[PDB]
Amino acid sequence: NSSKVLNPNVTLPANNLLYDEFFVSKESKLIEDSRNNKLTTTSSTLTSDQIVVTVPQKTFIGGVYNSTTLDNLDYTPISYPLDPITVSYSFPSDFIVDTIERPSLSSMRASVFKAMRAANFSGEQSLAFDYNIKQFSYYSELKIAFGSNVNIGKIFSIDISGSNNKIKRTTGVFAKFTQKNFTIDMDLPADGNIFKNNSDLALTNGKNPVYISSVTYGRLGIISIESNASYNEVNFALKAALTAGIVNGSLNIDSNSKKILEESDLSVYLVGGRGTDAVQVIKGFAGFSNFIVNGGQFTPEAPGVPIYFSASHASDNSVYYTTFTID
Ligand SMILES: [Ca+2]
Ligand code: NA
């Protein structure tokens, strides 16, 4: 009859939307190999189809939400029954397929455990973090790292309304850094309509339904640094932390870089920290260091958590995205 999609366009007060620098780890490269074997990206316009997890209990493959309710963390569900889904797990060294009869958080967890147990693993996990680094001046620019128009002030419990959106120190740097275990991808619906009773699609008119069609597991951080050191000094120090050796539980970072980060105003949004399924926001280098140091091997019992996801429109199965623009 007709397919309507709503894909947000968000203007940011940045001069550039693309990361200044980035590093891709072997494991993340190999996962994409497995995905492929089996977008506008300019400084002034950037399409984002990856959304960092903000509501862990609702972020499971096959979940269906009103797309206009994601940015404020409401995630209003659309609860009509779904057809069973077919999902593929792309690992660094394997590709595993499963069927989930009734998409739910518990069903995803059970499927993940089964896939982790079945998967072939080759060589040793390197534990290197991927990282993506960008200078910033306004806290709203961190929406880039989250991949969507989230409320940065509420996530980080900071007042950035009005003139407080601007950093107070000389230099601002943020980064997104990840250790990826695997990516789950949902097959397109067999009959073109995710709903078990296809006529329920028409009942979702006006509810802007999107379904979670890809979920990546691992651990993730988004760090914000405000410092009176220079961009090059902060950026070097940040990379030194992210790439430092870990010896008997100690981050073997050079002393000057540690001092820069300790002296800075440093917050990290963490998904997949040890012990918790919740997201955490920490302040200070010590908590950042602890997260890096304890980022260990993935196992079936400790597979990480959902760290980011993609969604698709139920009307036509196209990918849901945010377009970021400058000015
Ligand atoms: Ca159907
Ligand atoms: Na390094």
Numbering used by the authors: 33 to 70, 89 to 377
Pull text from the paper.
We previously reported that Elizabethkingia anophelis, a bacterial species of the phylum Bacteroidota and a commensal of the malarial mosquito midgut produces a 2-component CDC-like (CDCL) set of proteins, encoded by adjacent genes: one large (CDCLL) and one smaller component (CDCLS). The studies herein show that, unlike their CDC relatives, the CDCLs require proteolytic activation of two distinct components that then interact and form a pore to kill bacteria using a mechanism only described for the mammalian complement membrane attack complex (MAC). This type of mechanism is only used by the complement MAC wherein a single C5b8 membrane complex recruits many C9 components to form its β-barrel pore.
The in vitro activation site for each CDCL pair resides in their regions that are analogous to the β-tongue region of the CDCs. The propeptide of the CDCLS blocks β1, which must be exposed to interact with β4 of CDCLL and of other CDCLS that oligomerize to form the β-barrel pore.
